[PDB]
């Protein structure tokens, strides 16, 4: 037998495709390839590819693809469209994977909604623990989204319980904003300041802050984003400048140096695609956790009987029989993949059990600590703390 | 979305409701599907990635009662105030408010309410 695995996704079509497609393919391939998973099934799949936006087209490609009939769903990657994909995978009892945050629906908890990303809450613990470790009582943090703010809760909220003053500063859409607020970062003297960004932003943020030449052992800089690998790396400064980060990506191993530099040929043997900044060839979070995905759903249906297809209408509201044992053995299971160890709570399809593990660079690198949802932060450890003649 | 088909095959000139926004999503999709306009009774999550002309709320803006707060704050001149607020959802109308102390130096304290 095979198994059927759907994927839409509403990506901008005027410029060569997304990668996580390519990414996907890589996996699934990856797993034909090996018979240690299961030697009887092969998983298959159809790729559909549309424009981004109008949700009615979105619709139609669910009904469509339902007309087959598949064991669970991949995109769409905007909210818009997620709202009536899950209201008909809910009413079809049809379990839905997806590969991003997206707002959280707090009126009610959707069982078939499972999403594997560690949390902004989750976020927001770490930069209280870190910055309670570095014991400062002054700290201006910026975003440049209302999302923003929800990854800074606990922050917002700290100096109801301690002696911290924060300064929330706002960044207006478009990347030539920041000149004004950077000379107000001038008249104001400060030093210790947190960028709340995406990592799309993070790499024209630090050129034009090098432009500038803010960045000295004077300030203190820290990212929200996950990943420091990833960002442009031109920080070789004999100047002195302090840059830490959390790192999600596990690089020891051996093993998953060798997956992640099987991609990192596979890139280049294509011909060079144009970017922003970011260097081409070192692994993107959203990806490799549809990669962790692609495994969710290969260990999901190593335990479940051979497919049935099913025809049925999106109009229609007659429930097919293995969506929830499929459910059920999804919401059970748990693995070790390129973001780490995941499981799943008894509540909710909201990921858990984050690893978040604190980076900085010193090398112009070291293991400094780490988070988890499980305890508070582990100091791991505790430096060398070298001093010089 | 089925009561909006039945509504659709009897034939009205718009539609009113339903209260809440969750599946008034819905029933913006159906709408602007064969683009005919939709009234809605409150406030409702504006579409920030995509652009409708089609979205009738009578409800105030959130920028204009907070404009009205920040006028009334600084015209009375307190320079020590604190705001208690129901949620993260409360603080959207409330943004500019603790902005503000960037033109100025009012000390604003602030605090979470619990769903109790």
Known sequence: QVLRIGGIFETVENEPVNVEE????????????????????????????INLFDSFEASRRACDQL???????????????VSAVQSICNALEVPHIQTRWKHPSVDSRDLFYINLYPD???????????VLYYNWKTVTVVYEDSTGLIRLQELIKA????????????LPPANKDAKPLLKEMKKSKEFYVIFDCSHETAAEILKQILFMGMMTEYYHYFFTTLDLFALDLELYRYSGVNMTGFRLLNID??????????????????????????????????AALMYDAVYMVAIASHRASQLTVSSLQCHRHKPWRLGPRFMNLIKEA???????????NKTDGLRKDFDLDIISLKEEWKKIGIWNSNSGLNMTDGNRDRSNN
């Not at 393919?25 to 790729?47: C, E, G, H, Q, W």
């Not at 051996?254 to 280049?268: A, C, F, G, Q, T």
């Not at 748990?334 to 799943?344: A, N, Q, S």
């Open 159 to 170: 100096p109801s319980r301690y002696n911290i003053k924060i300064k929330i500063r706002q």
């Open 67 to 81: 007309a087959l009939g598949v064991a669970a769903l991949f995109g769409p990657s905007h909210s818009s469209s």
């Open 22 to 49: 390519l990414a996907f393919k890589f996996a699934v391939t990856s797993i034909n390839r090996n018979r240690t998973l299961m030697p009887n099934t092969t998983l298959t799949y159809d790729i559909q590819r």
């Open 120 to 130: 902004y809450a989750a976020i927001s613990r770490a930069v209280l623990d870190l």
């Open 334 to 344: 748990r693995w070790d993949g390129l973001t780490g160890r995941i499981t799943f």
């Open 253 to 286: 191993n051996p093993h998953v140096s060798s997956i992640i530099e099987k991609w990192s040929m596979e890139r280049l043997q294509a011909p060079p695609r144009p970017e922003t900044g970011l260097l081409d060839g070192m692994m993107t979070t959203e």
